């Protein structure tokens, strides 16, 4: 499973504790494929893996903010391509995700602000932009 110390968790995510939420997801979905795969592969994931990934999310954020804050619409060629990046790297770190699959993840993204507050810590008013950018992206990439 996840190999991190309360003090180390923060070094990689910063406040996000999987153990506490581990129990919570168990009750919420306690049987979804996306979740089972996380447990499946994560058991093999080390710190080096999560950090390379977090740095990945950060980078992904850096472009979203530079492009998003630019007042660029979420269905922008610039925004749509962002989502492409979002799907590629995210699926390979937790589970093979489809357009229909996580596009919806994108809409429920706002429902549990636990996600939004940790993500938006980098920019106020982004969790929602990701949702429109990601959801829209699935529209054109879903034939």
């Amino acid at each position: 499973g996840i190999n991190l110390t309360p003090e180390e968790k923060f070094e990689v995510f910063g406040d996000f504790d999987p153990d506490q939420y581990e129990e919570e997801v168990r009750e919420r979905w306690g049987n979804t494929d996306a979740y089972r795969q996380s447990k499946e592969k994560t058991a093999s994931y080390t710190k080096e893996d999560w950090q390379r990934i977090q740095d990945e999310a950060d980078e992904l954020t850096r472009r979203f903010v530079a492009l998003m804050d630019a007042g660029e619409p979420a269905d922008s060629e610039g925004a749509m391509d962002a989502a492409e990046d979002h799907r590629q790297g995210i699926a390979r770190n937790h589970y093979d995700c489809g357009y229909e699959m996580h596009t919806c993840l994108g809409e429920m993204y706002v429902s549990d602000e636990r996600f939004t507050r940790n993500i938006d810590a980098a920019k106020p008013g982004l969790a929602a932009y990701m949702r429109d950018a990601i959801l829209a992206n699935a529209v054109r990439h879903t034939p």
Binding site: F16, V25, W29, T32, E100, F115, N118
Partner: peptide, 12 residues
């Protein structure tokens, strides 16, 4: 889904 809190989830 997945973690409640970093980026994947549960619900489609």
């Amino acid at each position: 889904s997945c973690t409640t809190c970093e980026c994947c989830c549960s619900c489609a």
